[PDB]
Swiss-Prot record, chain A:
Annotated keywords: GTP-binding, Host-virus interaction, Hydrolase, mRNA capping, mRNA processing, Multifunctional enzyme, Nucleotide-binding, Nucleotidyltransferase, Nucleus, Protein phosphatase, Transferase
Full protein: residues contained: 229 to 567 of 597
Primary gene name: RNGTT
Principal subcellular localisation of the protein: nucleus
A cellular-component GO term for this protein: nucleoplasm
Any one GO molecular function term: phosphoprotein phosphatase activity
Function: Bifunctional mRNA-capping enzyme exhibiting RNA 5'-triphosphate monophosphatase activity in the N-terminal part and mRNA guanylyltransferase activity in the C-terminal part. Catalyzes the first two steps of cap formation: by removing the gamma-phosphate from the 5'-triphosphate end of nascent mRNA to yield a diphosphate end, and by transferring the GMP moiety of GTP to the 5'-diphosphate terminus of RNA via a covalent enzyme-GMP reaction intermediate.
Listed name of the protein: mRNA-capping enzyme
Taxonomic lineage of the native organism: Eukaryota, Metazoa, Chordata, Craniata, Vertebrata
Subcellular location(s) of the protein: Nucleus
Species name: Homo sapiens (Human)
Entry binding sites for GTP: R71, R87, D115, G116, E117, K220, W221, K222, R290, Q291, R292, T293, D294, K295
Assembly information from the UniProt record: Interacts with POLR2A (via C-terminus); this enhances guanylyltransferase activity. Binds (via GTase domain) to the elongating phosphorylated form of RNA polymerase II; can form direct interactions with the phosphorylated POLR2A C-terminal domain and indirect interactions via bound RNA. Interacts with SUPT5H and RNMT. Interacts with HIV-1 Tat. (Microbial infection) Interacts with HIV-1 Tat.
UniProtKB/Swiss-Prot annotation, chain C:
General function of this protein: S-adenosyl-L-methionine-dependent methyltransferase that mediates mRNA cap1 2'-O-ribose methylation to the 5'-cap structure of mRNAs. Methylates the ribose of the first nucleotide of a m(7)GpppG-capped mRNA and small nuclear RNA (snRNA) to produce m(7)GpppRm (cap1). Displays a preference for cap0 transcripts. Cap1 modification is linked to higher levels of translation. May be involved in the interferon response pathway.
Keyword Methyltransferase in annotation: yes
Protein name: Cap-specific mRNA (nucleoside-2'-O-)-methyltransferase 1
Effect upon mutating K63A: Reduces both mRNA cap binding and catalytic activity of the enzyme
Cellular component GO terms, alphabetical: cytoplasm; intracellular membrane-bounded organelle; nucleoplasm; nucleus
Name of encoding gene: CMTR1
Localisation per UniProt entry: Nucleus
Stretch list, region Interaction with POLR2A: 587-695
Ligand binding (substrate): K63, S64, V65, F66, D67, R78, N234, L235, Q236, N299
Keywords attached to this entry: Acetylation, Methyltransferase, mRNA capping, mRNA processing, Nucleus, Phosphoprotein, S-adenosyl-L-methionine, Transferase
EC nos: 2.1.1.57
Reactions the enzyme catalyzes: a 5'-end (N(7)-methyl 5'-triphosphoguanosine)-ribonucleoside in mRNA + S-adenosyl-L-methionine = a 5'-end (N(7)-methyl 5'-triphosphoguanosine)-(2'-O-methyl-ribonucleoside) in mRNA + S-adenosyl-L-homocysteine + H(+)
Length: 329, 171, 695
């Protein structure tokens, strides 16, 4: 899926289709996560519902602001050795991004695995790509993922940042040469989310060891407004013995054999046939907000459903707020 | 000839498609069903001018749908044997001549085209022309043809015209 | 034969040239007795005049050792024994394209970037000039694909090859825009046989090539002629002699002064073949005999390479034309042309002769080692060239050839390809309607010198070329679909144009014949070269060359592509002189307003587009003291007589800022039109306004 980050092209980043190199990069991630199945090892968060939000009271939590971004695990193996992994398992080599070892600045990091997002940013009216490091799985083969989220959070600071800063102070690293900015997402204790609220939602992160796979205790909250599902749009005349063969816009989701829903087909909706259509929910209806040129297939069925489970039994912008404030007492 | 007649056609309405406004559904159903059609007795059904009369709805016994006999003023067209009609040339062939009259394809064979109008592929449009190069029948021209006979196939008519008699060819 | 004493295989190739020919070019009186007709000799063993007898017999013996061998066994041993075999065609249609890639590197890019005698490039990609080339005996045009791919559309190719299984496979040009190439098969043009040996094919092609090159000829000719000599491989020179002559005669017929030539040859032992090389050495500033590493080491295949065609080569061309007529008369007789230059003339040039012998003997010595190496690799099947993959990678790096597979283009849909070609430019720019020119909008054409105008004959559309007949149009509205163009025409991939469709009526009334033609109004992308930011006339200069590049004059069954005639707005008076009242087929005998083009064709005009070519804050004035136009910056108050780079109106400003003066009923633009509507601008109103605002 060779689009690396959508909205910009970035210097040096390149999909890796070389057969020997790719099988390696992927293999080593599964390895580092202690991961079972096929595909992406990365921890997968779940959407907050009225049942989940009870966990914010069961153990300690940290919270940060989600921005829509793209999910990339960054594998730092060596000197030009840096790679990036997709939700898809797509692998990309990054070129002039260099990570100094904190003890010896001449050395480089190896056997390190990072978790984070690629986000585009705005200052000058032009796009500045950024990699935000929100977790760390391995360091020097050291299994820092089994450590505690504050431990891991600190590690990322002194092991992956301070060093890249020192070498920038000296001009061994001209920030300018590197394909993108590199930063750690700051996280806050549970009690501080009230002061905070392209930032599309919240992330609620537990204090325990890193786990790959579906994580029922890592909660992504989105305001019910922004809830959206991607269907493939199929409109067909529908009057076989029916008097009016009015063409009807049907919406399709991945994994489901028959139609998921219906949209009322607008005069404008039609040219989007066969192409992914992005829909919101409002009136007990679906609505067309935009077109996506980045996928030839819809969301997973169980994804669409967990969208619905979210919209009908929602966690409200206000519901979340009372829950936090009470516990802040 | 472009005709303004009255025609009768029966519409079948299932009770799912009644609605609060019932008669507009029948009007939209008639504008859907018979517009753009072609029948052997009434020709190219171009459009429905004005839906004049809506009959009484006979509930068919055992069936659910109601049946409406409908009279309607309609614009139609019929091709005729021997009628001299204006036309747009779409293709000149060594075998014949593809022209159009409205939506109708009309095929004029060269064997019923006189010996003056020879075929030329060597011109950059392949065309019909004389050795005097005076009458040049090529693509996208305005011509006139005499319709000899019509053949209806798959609920649509095509025709065959000719240029043998006087004053036929280019306008 | 010890073949193990060969130098280590390398991507570094050496070129030895002939000396510079110090003799004058032979005239018709000097050459008057040079053509010796003798008995037809089919013996190569005694052709020792330009190679030592022991080497000639040794290479002939080493060839004939394979006559008893299975061809698939030979081919497999050869594939292991040749250090260069892994190069193949890479992404091109065949391995011949890679020979041209190799030789165009070795010869300082002289084919793809030809130079004058002062070392300046003869073609600049930003100027209105095209790289004209020819490719003869060249089916399926692998050599052409590399040149077209290397220069994109900034080139125009002309082809002649025999009709048959080895015709031009233009469909198979996956890496190049085949629309930039024009096959021509001699007499009858597209319907000819393509026989290079036949003179009439040469003559019709010759007139056609000179016409399609402003009567100058091509910058270079390539020639890759050869045919099967299966079971007579030792006689390949003698059998191909007339094809060699006709390719050399073609160079002197269509290459321009200072132009270049490259021709495949085989062995060069016969005085006939050496006399043909001597005539090229007389006719060019520099000649060499070269075997590229992309040629197989054990075959007689080499290239003659000629640089800088001299002035005054006409007598040698017309002599070789007479020799070809004589060879054609002697076909199937016991007589043949055995000399084209006397042996005493050739051997009188000791510097030419010493190079010719040394070139032949060096080639024989290398070919003998390479034949003995293949024989050893047939006898021992464990032998292999270990460096083939290393040498391949280095050759591709050196020649600037990307290491990628041959992929059929990808089929893009016209909407996705339009978004790729616009590179994130806002789509709404393509939806802008022209401002109507009316008495209320007439002031917008001030200052007059900032504007150009052109006569329209249909509504404006966008046109995208995806290669060959995959041409689509779009009417600029986001709701509208790309429609496939129902015209017999061809365009290179990665082409994005602003066009109209114009039917060109020929004659009048019943005899009138109208043919629709593509009329280019402006250009955005030409075969993957973006031109949108260039000045309107400068963009049009690139556009005008493109129409010739995609032209097909041997194919009168194809729909023509044209560029609109662009007028200066202060010269709009010249448009009305070309307006005539003509009797159109189907107008009931009523004359219609018709605009007559550069040829004997006319169309019914719909109106006149007025396009701004100068960007704000700049504008063009006329200096009465200097009698020259100048650019004035309204913000800084600066004035200059040179074109400011920021004064250039790019495509989006030209398109957005355009006016349209419609020519419907009630508008007087020709003196035979009555009545005039008083609310509508006449020719006289617009010309009066223009005259008041020229000063």
């Amino acid at each position: 899926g060779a689009i690396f980050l959508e909205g910009v092209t970035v210097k040096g980043v390149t999909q890796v289709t070389t057969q020997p190199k790719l099988g390696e990069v992927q293999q080593k991630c599964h390895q580092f996560c202690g991961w079972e199945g096929s595909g992406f090892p990365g921890a997968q968060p779940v959407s907050m519902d009225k049942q989940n939000i009870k966990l914010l009271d069961l153990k300690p939590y940290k919270v940060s602001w989600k921005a829509d971004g793209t999910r990339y695990m960054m594998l730092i193996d060596g000197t030009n050795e840096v790679f990036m992994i997709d939700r898809d398992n797509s692998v990309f080599h990054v070129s002039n991004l260099e990570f100094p070892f904190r003890k010896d600045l001449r050395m480089h990091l190896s056997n390190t695995l990072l978790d984070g997002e690629m986000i585009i940013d705005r200052v000058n009216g032009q796009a500045v790509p950024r990699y935000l490091i929100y977790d760390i799985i391995k360091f020097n083969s050291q299994p820092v993922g089994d450590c505690d989220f504050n431990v891991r959070l600190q590690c990322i600071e002194r092991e992956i940042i301070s060093p890249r800063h020192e070498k920038m102070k000296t001009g061994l690293i001209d920030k300018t040469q590197e394909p993108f900015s590199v930063r750690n997402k700051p996280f806050f204790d549970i009690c501080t989310s009230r002061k905070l609220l392209e930032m599309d939602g919240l992330i609620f992160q537990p204090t325990g060891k890193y786990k790959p796979g579906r994580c029922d205790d890592i909660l992504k909250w989105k305001p019910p407004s922004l809830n959206s599902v991607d269907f493939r749009l199929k409109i067909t005349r529908m009057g076989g013995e029916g008097l009016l063969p009015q063409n009807v816009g049907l919406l399709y989701v991945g994994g489901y054999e028959r139609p998921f829903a219906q949209i009322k087909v607008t005069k404008e909706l039609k040219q989007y046939d066969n192409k992914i259509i992005e829909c919101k929910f409002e009136n007990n209806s679906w609505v067309f907000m935009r077109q996506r040129t980045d996928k030839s297939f819809p969301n997973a069925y169980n994804t669409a459903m967990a969208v619905c489970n979210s919209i009908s039994n929602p966690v409200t912008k206000e519901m979340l707020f009372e829950f936090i404030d009470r516990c802040t007492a | 000839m472009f005709y303004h007649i009255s025609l009768e056609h029966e519409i079948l309405l299932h009770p799912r498609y009644f609605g609060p406004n019932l008669l507009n559904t029948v009007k939209q159903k008639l504008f859907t069903e018979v517009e753009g059609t072609c029948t052997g007795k009434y020709g190219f059904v171009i459009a429905v001018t004005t839906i004049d009369n809506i009959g009484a709805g006979v509930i068919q016994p055992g069936r659910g749908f109601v049946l409406y006999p409908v009279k309607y003023k309609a614009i139609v067209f019929r091709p005729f044997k021997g009628e001299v009609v204006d036309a747009v040339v779409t293709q000149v062939n060594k075998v014949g001549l593809f022209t159009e009259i409205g939506p109708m394809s009309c095929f004029i064979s060269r064997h019923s085209i006189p010996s003056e109008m020879e075929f030329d592929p060597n011109s950059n449009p392949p065309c019909y022309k004389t050795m005097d190069e005076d009458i040049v029948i090529q693509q996208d021209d305005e011509i006139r043809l005499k319709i000899v006979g019509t053949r209806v196939d798959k609920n649509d008519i095509f025709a065959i015209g000719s240029l043998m008699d006087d004053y036929l060819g280019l306008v | 034969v010890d073949w193990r004493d060969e130098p280590e295989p390398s991507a570094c190739e050496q070129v030895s040239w002939f000396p510079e020919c110090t003799t004058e070019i032979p005239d018709t009186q000097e050459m008057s007795d040079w053509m010796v007709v003798g008995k037809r000799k089919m013996i190569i063993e005694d052709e020792t005049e330009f190679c030592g007898e022991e080497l000639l017999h040794s290479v002939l013996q080493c060839k004939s050792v394979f006559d008893v061998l299975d061809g698939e066994e030979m081919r497999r041993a050869r594939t292991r024994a040749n250090p260069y075999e892994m190069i193949r065609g890479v992404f091109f249609l065949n391995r011949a394209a890679m020979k041209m890639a190799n030789m165009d590197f070795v010869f300082d890019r002289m084919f793809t970037n030809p130079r004058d005698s002062y070392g300046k490039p003869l073609v600049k990609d930003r100027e209105a000039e095209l790289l004209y080339f020819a490719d003869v005996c060249a089916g399926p045009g692998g050599f052409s694909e590399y040149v077209l791919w290397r220069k994109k559309w900034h080139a125009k190719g002309f082809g002649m090859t025999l009709k048959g299984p080895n015709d031009f496979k233009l469909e198979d040009f996956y890496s190049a825009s085949s629309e930039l190439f024009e096959p021509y098969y001699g007499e009858g043009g597209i319907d000819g046989d393509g026989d290079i040996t036949r003179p009439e094919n040469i003559s019709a092609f010759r007139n056609f090539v000179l016409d399609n090159t402003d009567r100058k000829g091509v910058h270079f000719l390539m020639a890759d002629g050869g045919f099967s000599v299966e079971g007579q491989e030792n006689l390949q020179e003698i059998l191909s002699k007339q094809l060699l002559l006709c390719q050399f005669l073609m160079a002197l017929s269509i290459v321009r002064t200072g132009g270049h030539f490259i021709c495949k040859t085989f062995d060069l032992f016969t005085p006939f073949s050496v006399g043909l090389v001597y005539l090229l050495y007389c006719c060019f500033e520099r000649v060499c005999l070269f075997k590229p590493i992309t040629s197989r080491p054990a075959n007689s295949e080499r290239y003659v390479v000629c640089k800088g065609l001299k002035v005054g080569i006409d007598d040698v061309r017309d002599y070789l034309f007479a020799v070809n007529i004589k060879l054609n008369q002697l076909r199937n007789t016991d007589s043949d042309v055995n000399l084209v230059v006397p042996l005493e003339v050739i051997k009188g040039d000791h510097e030419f002769t010493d190079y010719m012998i040394r070139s032949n003997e060096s080639h024989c010595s290398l070919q003998i080692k390479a034949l003995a190496k293949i024989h050893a690799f047939v006898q021992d099947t464990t032998l292999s060239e270990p460096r083939q993959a290393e040498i391949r990678k280095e050759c591709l790096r050196l020649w600037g050839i990307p290491d990628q597979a041959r992929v059929a283009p990808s089929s893009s849909d016209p909407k996705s390809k339009f978004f790729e070609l616009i590179q994130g430019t806002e789509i709404d720019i393509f939806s802008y309607k022209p401002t109507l020119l009316t008495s209320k909008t007439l002031e917008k054409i001030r200052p007059v010198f900032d504007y150009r105008c052109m006569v329209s004959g249909s509504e404006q559309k966008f046109l995208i070329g995806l290669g060959k007949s995959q041409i689509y149009t779009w009417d600029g509205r986001q709701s509208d679909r790309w429609i496939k163009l129902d015209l017999k025409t061809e365009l290179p991939r990665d082409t994005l144009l602003s066009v109209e469709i114009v039917h060109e009526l020929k004659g009048e009334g019943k005899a009138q014949r109208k043919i629709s033609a593509i009329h280019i109004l402006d250009v955005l992308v030409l075969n993957g070269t973006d031109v949108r930011e260039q000045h309107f006339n400068q963009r049009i200069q690139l556009a005008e060359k493109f129409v010739k590049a995609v032209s097909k004059p041997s194919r009168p069954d194809m729909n023509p592509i044209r560029v609109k005639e662009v007028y200066r707005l202060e010269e709009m008076e010249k448009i009305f002189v070309r307006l005539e009242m003509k009797i159109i087929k189907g107008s009931s005998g009523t004359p219609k307003l018709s605009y007559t083009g550069r040829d004997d064709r006319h169309f019914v005009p719909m109106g006149l587009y007025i396009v701004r070519t100068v960007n704000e804050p700049w504008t063009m004035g006329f200096s009465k003291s200097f009698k020259k136009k100048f650019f004035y910056n309204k913000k800084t108050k600066d004035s200059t007589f040179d074109l400011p780079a920021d004064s250039i109106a790019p495509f989006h400003i030209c398109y957005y800022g355009r006016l349209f003066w419609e020519w419907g009923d009630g508008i007087r633009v020709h003196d035979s039109q009555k009545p005039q509507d008083q609310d509508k601008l006449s020719k006289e109103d617009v010309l009066s306004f223009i005259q008041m605002h020229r000063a």
